[PDB]
Amino acid sequence: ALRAQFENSNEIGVFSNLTNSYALVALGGSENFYSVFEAELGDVVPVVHTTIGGTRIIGRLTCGNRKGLLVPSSTTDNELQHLRNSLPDPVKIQRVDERLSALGNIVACNDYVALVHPDIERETEEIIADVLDVEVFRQTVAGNVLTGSYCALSNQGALVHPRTSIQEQDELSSLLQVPLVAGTINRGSDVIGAGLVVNDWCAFAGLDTTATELAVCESIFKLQD
Amino acid sequence: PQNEYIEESIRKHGRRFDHEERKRKKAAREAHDASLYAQKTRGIKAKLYQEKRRKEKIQMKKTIKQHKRMITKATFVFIRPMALRQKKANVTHKELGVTMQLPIIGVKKNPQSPTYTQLGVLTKGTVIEVNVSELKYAQITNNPELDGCVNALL
Amino acid sequence: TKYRMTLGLPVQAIMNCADNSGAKNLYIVSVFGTGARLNRLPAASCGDMVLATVKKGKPDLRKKIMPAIVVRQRKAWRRKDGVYLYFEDNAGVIVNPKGEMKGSAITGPVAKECADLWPRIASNAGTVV
Amino acid sequence: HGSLGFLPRKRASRQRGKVKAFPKDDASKPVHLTAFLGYKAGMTHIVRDLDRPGSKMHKREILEAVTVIETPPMVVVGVVGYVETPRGLRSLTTVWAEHLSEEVKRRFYKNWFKSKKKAFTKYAKKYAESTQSINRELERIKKYCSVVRVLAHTQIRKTPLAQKKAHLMEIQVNGGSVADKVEWAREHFEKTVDIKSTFEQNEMIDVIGVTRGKGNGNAGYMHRTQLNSKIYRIGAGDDAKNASTDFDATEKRITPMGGFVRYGVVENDFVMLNGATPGPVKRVLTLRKSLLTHTSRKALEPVSLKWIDTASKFGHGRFQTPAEAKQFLGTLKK
Amino acid sequence: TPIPDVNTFLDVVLSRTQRKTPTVIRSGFKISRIRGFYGRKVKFTQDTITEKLDSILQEFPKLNDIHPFHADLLNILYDRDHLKIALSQLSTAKHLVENVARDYIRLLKYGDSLYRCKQLKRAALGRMATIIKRQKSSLEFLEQVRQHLSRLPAIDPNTRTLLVCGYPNVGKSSFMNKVTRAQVDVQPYAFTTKSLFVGHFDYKYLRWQVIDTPGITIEMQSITAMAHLRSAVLYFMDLSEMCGYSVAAQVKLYHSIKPLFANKVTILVLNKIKVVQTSCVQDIGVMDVRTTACEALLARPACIPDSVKTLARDIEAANGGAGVYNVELRDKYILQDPSWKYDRMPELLDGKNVADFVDPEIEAKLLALDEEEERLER
Amino acid sequence: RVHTCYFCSGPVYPGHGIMFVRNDSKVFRFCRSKCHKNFKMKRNPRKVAWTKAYRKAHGKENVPVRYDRNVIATTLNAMKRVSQVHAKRERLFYKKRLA
RNA sequence: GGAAGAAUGGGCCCACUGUCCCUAUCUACUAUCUAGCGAAACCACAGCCUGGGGGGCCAGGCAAAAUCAGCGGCUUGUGGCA
RNA sequence: UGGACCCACUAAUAGGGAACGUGAGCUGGCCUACUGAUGAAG
RNA sequence: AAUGCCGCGGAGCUAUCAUCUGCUGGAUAACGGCUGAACGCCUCUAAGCCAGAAUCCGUGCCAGAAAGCGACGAUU
RNA sequence: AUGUGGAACGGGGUAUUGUAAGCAGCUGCUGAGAUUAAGCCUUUGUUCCCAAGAUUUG
């Protein structure tokens, strides 16, 4: 687990997207964040510096996995062409034209199990299942439609809002087939997805995240070893 | 930091290398600077320089030697304003040499005019009777209309 | 930061709240960070922090001079790409000075200028258009 | 009220912009020009990548309004000599060329046709008779004078303008010794100097001209000089591939469909300027290399155009060229 | 706020009054205008004095309102009773000045002539100056109090803390200096640490405040702090008696100080070797003692890559630095041909989005379409 | 990329026109002011003679790919050939419509 | 935007509006010119400003005809008495 | 500075004068200037 | 139908409702110093010098003397 | 004051409105018709105009 901040904000998840095989970074911002990502997992997985739709909210607006990556249809075709050039050939990128523009904030996807907002269109869910090659379940996290932003998903564990019930958390963990912990990061911030990003082997959290929260996240994700 | 935090940094790191000769240099050339002060400045800050220079000059000389129908004046109880009315006077005893704020029991006579004496107007030189039990007529040695206080001598 | 963008929400205006916090209608009082201009009422627009009072909603929340961020605008303003944008109504969010909203969701599309400027607003956004 | 400095608000005494300030000479530098004078035709808008380092809009797409100024190559017709004196710059003498362009002769005459065209006739013969006298004057210029300006005029024939009078003006020749400037002026007699000589598709130029007139204090028709105003492109309309942005290809010409409003069709060398310029359409403008030396990033960055718009400025046009228009529209009876 | 001298404060107040209010009043104006001018100057003088007094009162805290540890230390190290007396004297002086100003303003309300106003204006200033001059020692005490308060630390008894007290120079300060990043100077002279030193420390993801205490005014301050503090005692007894105090003397001192050590975890540190032996000379066991004291006070597999199992900022800084460095996206591309990666592409031609209508299969489709078109034409 | 007008159904170049988004996350681009007002008044494009929708339905008419030099070069020539072939069919269609 | 200075008006509220932000545009007339006709008040003499004794005086600054159009005229920061 | 001593922004919302400030800019309890437009003449 | 009513309406006008642009050299005050007497020391000062304020004066920006002037073309 | 001259018209291009009247059989003519510079662009289009009158100038 590495703690860092983008510009002057520790909300790394909004400004960057981390997958199990690729990393998404913003363009025109602080070069230190790109250097930190390159030093952490650049030599292991690719890190692409590009903006979707000309914005630095690519992390909080785009959703994807190691198998496939989904971007909003509003993204420029020129941006899509650059993404394919940067991304490896085995990485699948598909444009999603759905009633929900924020793919990342609405749906959080893991390498095997994905949970999406109940309002997602059937065609988008079929496209997401076809692209990510994972099971997609339309449910809610802590009674919030923005499951992809208020909750964090990872292969070795999951993070949920601290207000989630134990029975609901147990049901979600059983459904996701992975351990789940309900809590807050970035010193009590309830946007776990916006405030934390964890990969299969590495995790990147905000620079202002509490040590106890960082220790809890490392144990939950088994990133200590 | 804690306690006299700059007093162990000096203890552990040392002093500004060139502070002492700078302060020695400042303590020397200030003599020329002081004279240049009086030859350039003007106004109140120059006036404030003047008497403060002489104050320490004479003090130094001492140590080396040792080496509408209304009342326009304050009254005691036309129209006499309540604010202008006064009942306490800081009359100073002559033999005792102690100034005490005594109540104005009454006014004996006002030298300005008998009408002022009838009105009990407090004026300089007017005779006023004040109780001396805690210690009698007394003459006002000041003008309360300008001084703002009933200053008198027993 | 944020570039020059058309201001069309002057003081003494009623503006609609689009979160689940229970607030419905918002009354503008003053605009943060306004210059000392002569005879020019400060205005508001998407992504701008202003002082507003909840006209209707939860009684405890209202009667408080609190910062508000506008997220929707009727007026047509130019985006730096060269296209003009306008929305069906004026919508804002209930937010503390730190930059956190009491509510936990937003309704309808969200201007990317508001979303990019305030990262947690984008976190709460589900439709950014 | 407005600025106190720009007072009085009286109408300009010059129809065409006059360059009062010129870049400082440097003999170490080679001989080069400093000022240009073209014609403002109109404006369009272009699409361009914005490669501004450190900005939030870094390495992405931005739209910028541009102005189109036709700049046909001038004809150098003469040189003048200037002497630095305790009373300022004084004109020592002036030498010209032999075959003056006929538009220049229109400048000297208010009623050309009625006149017997007697301008410079005896000067022409005395040059052909004895070039020694001219050589002596050029000897005077190269020896005594300190600031040298060449006489240049707009060649208005190839422009689509009703006016037939050439706008004559002087351009400083900065660089080299005095004799070097005169020799450069001599070898450039009677020939043409292109716009590409002075500006290089990315340079720091100051546009000068007389602003338009709003009618009656006076409101409009004053002399003005805008600073900054970076160049975006120096086109060459003589090439049929003049606009032809590399990103879009889309074979086209700078002239908007139906021609520039109240100007016509631009055919010759033209310059693209960001923002706006003083003065209305079909008016002569004057450009000059920026006086100061600033390496601000907004003045040093390179520019590679993405796409320019050649739509119909007349009305709400929506078509770039008839080649791309015809197949979209259904085949009409004509 | 800083505490100025009595003479300096009067001059600053007088200068500020003259600089802000006008000082040019011709005698030919109305009596009310002269009366208004004199009153405004007096009112400004009263306001400036009132603002200074209020700022002093606001800056001065309340001993009762302070925490029990802070108040006891303040009383011991600053004579809170004397400080309270001085503050009340200043408050009484401020009230007396306000009453005098109100009386002067009321007298000025019935002004008659310019000389009467001028005499009244001088009289008010002189009375205020005498009151300010009389309140001279209070300023000196306040300045000393401010300096002592500024040097004083911020006690946080709510958080976890470790109090080290006992015989002077028994190595407790050295252990505290080693445990926490705070470094308090130690000298061979006894009672070198006149004031307590607090050093933050981290242990088991918890913040511990290592606070040293004077060996046993300094002893009284150390006792008062230990009296009201949620911290564990760290009584260090010199086993080798190298601190100058005998083992029996240290034990007797620890027994006497046990009333303050009650309701807390007591650690018996055998210096210069809970009873913990710590070799002060050998600097051994300090970490173990600190740890003991801290303890006493208290199907989705992860596809980890082989590279994971087994900088950009520097590059940008070296070339042009931040804000002057342009990163080219062509380099960070997986294009097979390096020339193709560094070259541009056709975006839109002839009114058609070519980039949106060009596919890899078009290489063979175009040839097939050309053959199909020829067949259709034929 | 030049978008297609919602009402006018024509090419929309960057800069001109306006963009209108809806509550259902549907964004409509208007080619010109008249087209924007036409969509403002909810005029049916199939009921508008000057709209390509009526012209069509009245008898009157996502995965990015890796770039290749050869593919790009042939794409431009094919587009020109496609336009030439398509234009001829319309001329025949217009002749049939007139006849 | 909607009282921050037309609506139909309705029941403090609601609606409404260039009152305002912040003015912009248009039309008509007046204004303007040309032709003709054609006054009266008013008038010691006139008419550039600073300073000194106002426009006329003294010492300065300046100073180019004829005209058209909008349009002005001593006092300060320190109380008194013994 | 915006609003009825106040309550917020802002970097601050400094003090005055034009002796009856500007009541012949403002309200309540001919000629000479200035701005512009032409202009005969060495 | 004194511009009957309504929709759109180019060109013009205008929009801090739309866009563009808004410098760079010297001499200074406070002040920091250097050399250095007066005054065999010392001393920013006396003779001198260096640095230094959104300050001052120029550079640029506009007007161009209608009684300032120049180069040049023709000259019944 | 005889010319890639000028002008009036007209053609083409460009544009606004919305598909005319009429022929007809909603549809076809017909994405037509009308207007298009009076402060748009161009003119191998037809026409006439002109190598002119007066005033002051060493």
mmCIF file of N, CA and C in Angstrom, chain E residues 115-155:
data_model
loop_
_atom_site.group_PDB
_atom_site.id
_atom_site.type_symbol
_atom_site.label_atom_id
_atom_site.label_comp_id
_atom_site.label_asym_id
_atom_site.label_seq_id
_atom_site.Cartn_x
_atom_site.Cartn_y
_atom_site.Cartn_z
ATOM 1 N N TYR E 115 -11.129 77.154 22.461
ATOM 2 C CA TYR E 115 -10.212 77.001 23.586
ATOM 3 C C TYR E 115 -10.769 76.036 24.622
ATOM 4 N N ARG E 116 -12.076 76.113 24.887
ATOM 5 C CA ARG E 116 -12.701 75.149 25.786
ATOM 6 C C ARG E 116 -12.578 73.733 25.241
ATOM 7 N N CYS E 117 -12.807 73.559 23.937
ATOM 8 C CA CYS E 117 -12.632 72.247 23.324
ATOM 9 C C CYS E 117 -11.173 71.809 23.361
ATOM 10 N N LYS E 118 -10.251 72.725 23.054
ATOM 11 C CA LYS E 118 -8.834 72.380 23.068
ATOM 12 C C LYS E 118 -8.374 71.998 24.468
ATOM 13 N N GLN E 119 -8.795 72.761 25.479
ATOM 14 C CA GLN E 119 -8.466 72.405 26.855
ATOM 15 C C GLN E 119 -9.099 71.076 27.242
ATOM 16 N N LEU E 120 -10.345 70.849 26.822
ATOM 17 C CA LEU E 120 -11.000 69.576 27.100
ATOM 18 C C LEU E 120 -10.293 68.426 26.394
ATOM 19 N N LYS E 121 -9.874 68.641 25.144
ATOM 20 C CA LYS E 121 -9.176 67.591 24.408
ATOM 21 C C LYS E 121 -7.862 67.225 25.085
ATOM 22 N N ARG E 122 -7.099 68.231 25.520
ATOM 23 C CA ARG E 122 -5.861 67.954 26.241
ATOM 24 C C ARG E 122 -6.143 67.266 27.570
ATOM 25 N N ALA E 123 -7.186 67.707 28.276
ATOM 26 C CA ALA E 123 -7.494 67.139 29.585
ATOM 27 C C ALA E 123 -7.805 65.652 29.487
ATOM 28 N N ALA E 124 -8.580 65.253 28.476
ATOM 29 C CA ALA E 124 -8.893 63.840 28.298
ATOM 30 C C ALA E 124 -7.639 63.029 28.000
ATOM 31 N N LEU E 125 -6.762 63.553 27.142
ATOM 32 C CA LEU E 125 -5.537 62.835 26.804
ATOM 33 C C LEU E 125 -4.627 62.689 28.017
ATOM 34 N N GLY E 126 -4.490 63.755 28.810
ATOM 35 C CA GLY E 126 -3.638 63.680 29.985
ATOM 36 C C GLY E 126 -4.144 62.690 31.016
ATOM 37 N N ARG E 127 -5.459 62.669 31.242
ATOM 38 C CA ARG E 127 -6.031 61.709 32.180
ATOM 39 C C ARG E 127 -5.813 60.279 31.705
ATOM 40 N N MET E 128 -5.996 60.034 30.406
ATOM 41 C CA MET E 128 -5.738 58.705 29.862
ATOM 42 C C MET E 128 -4.263 58.341 29.972
ATOM 43 N N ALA E 129 -3.375 59.301 29.702
ATOM 44 C CA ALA E 129 -1.943 59.034 29.793
ATOM 45 C C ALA E 129 -1.534 58.689 31.219
ATOM 46 N N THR E 130 -2.079 59.410 32.202
ATOM 47 C CA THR E 130 -1.765 59.114 33.597
ATOM 48 C C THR E 130 -2.241 57.720 33.984
ATOM 49 N N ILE E 131 -3.437 57.337 33.532
ATOM 50 C CA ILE E 131 -3.935 55.990 33.799
ATOM 51 C C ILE E 131 -3.043 54.953 33.132
ATOM 52 N N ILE E 132 -2.642 55.208 31.884
ATOM 53 C CA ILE E 132 -1.759 54.282 31.183
ATOM 54 C C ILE E 132 -0.401 54.212 31.868
ATOM 55 N N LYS E 133 0.142 55.364 32.268
ATOM 56 C CA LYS E 133 1.435 55.382 32.944
ATOM 57 C C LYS E 133 1.370 54.647 34.278
ATOM 58 N N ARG E 134 0.258 54.796 35.004
ATOM 59 C CA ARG E 134 0.104 54.090 36.271
ATOM 60 C C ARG E 134 0.106 52.581 36.066
ATOM 61 N N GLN E 135 -0.565 52.106 35.016
ATOM 62 C CA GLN E 135 -0.609 50.678 34.700
ATOM 63 C C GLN E 135 0.629 50.306 33.884
ATOM 64 N N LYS E 136 1.782 50.395 34.546
ATOM 65 C CA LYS E 136 3.068 50.099 33.927
ATOM 66 C C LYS E 136 3.570 48.700 34.261
ATOM 67 N N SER E 137 3.541 48.322 35.541
ATOM 68 C CA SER E 137 4.029 47.005 35.937
ATOM 69 C C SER E 137 3.175 45.886 35.358
ATOM 70 N N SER E 138 1.888 46.152 35.114
ATOM 71 C CA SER E 138 1.019 45.133 34.536
ATOM 72 C C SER E 138 1.492 44.730 33.146
ATOM 73 N N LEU E 139 1.934 45.703 32.345
ATOM 74 C CA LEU E 139 2.448 45.391 31.016
ATOM 75 C C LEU E 139 3.692 44.515 31.096
ATOM 76 N N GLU E 140 4.594 44.818 32.033
ATOM 77 C CA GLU E 140 5.802 44.013 32.185
ATOM 78 C C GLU E 140 5.464 42.582 32.583
ATOM 79 N N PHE E 141 4.519 42.412 33.511
ATOM 80 C CA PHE E 141 4.100 41.071 33.901
ATOM 81 C C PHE E 141 3.447 40.339 32.737
ATOM 82 N N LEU E 142 2.616 41.042 31.963
ATOM 83 C CA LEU E 142 1.971 40.421 30.811
ATOM 84 C C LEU E 142 2.997 39.985 29.773
ATOM 85 N N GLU E 143 4.003 40.826 29.516
ATOM 86 C CA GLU E 143 5.041 40.465 28.556
ATOM 87 C C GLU E 143 5.815 39.238 29.018
ATOM 88 N N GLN E 144 6.164 39.185 30.306
ATOM 89 C CA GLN E 144 6.820 37.998 30.843
ATOM 90 C C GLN E 144 5.902 36.785 30.769
ATOM 91 N N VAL E 145 4.614 36.979 31.060
ATOM 92 C CA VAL E 145 3.655 35.880 30.978
ATOM 93 C C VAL E 145 3.537 35.382 29.544
ATOM 94 N N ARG E 146 3.482 36.304 28.581
ATOM 95 C CA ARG E 146 3.378 35.907 27.181
ATOM 96 C C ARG E 146 4.598 35.108 26.742
ATOM 97 N N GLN E 147 5.794 35.547 27.144
ATOM 98 C CA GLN E 147 7.006 34.813 26.794
ATOM 99 C C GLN E 147 7.010 33.425 27.422
ATOM 100 N N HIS E 148 6.608 33.325 28.691
ATOM 101 C CA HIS E 148 6.540 32.023 29.343
ATOM 102 C C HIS E 148 5.494 31.132 28.687
ATOM 103 N N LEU E 149 4.331 31.698 28.355
ATOM 104 C CA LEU E 149 3.285 30.916 27.703
ATOM 105 C C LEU E 149 3.725 30.450 26.321
ATOM 106 N N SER E 150 4.397 31.322 25.565
ATOM 107 C CA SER E 150 4.868 30.940 24.237
ATOM 108 C C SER E 150 5.877 29.803 24.318
ATOM 109 N N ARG E 151 6.799 29.873 25.280
ATOM 110 C CA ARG E 151 7.759 28.795 25.472
ATOM 111 C C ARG E 151 7.103 27.528 26.004
ATOM 112 N N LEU E 152 5.962 27.647 26.675
ATOM 113 C CA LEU E 152 5.300 26.482 27.231
ATOM 114 C C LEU E 152 4.755 25.589 26.116
ATOM 115 N N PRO E 153 4.718 24.280 26.337
ATOM 116 C CA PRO E 153 4.183 23.364 25.329
ATOM 117 C C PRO E 153 2.679 23.169 25.496
ATOM 118 N N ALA E 154 2.104 22.437 24.546
ATOM 119 C CA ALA E 154 0.675 22.134 24.540
ATOM 120 C C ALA E 154 0.485 20.733 25.111
ATOM 121 N N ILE E 155 0.048 20.664 26.368
ATOM 122 C CA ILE E 155 -0.172 19.378 27.016
ATOM 123 C C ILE E 155 -1.437 18.737 26.464
#
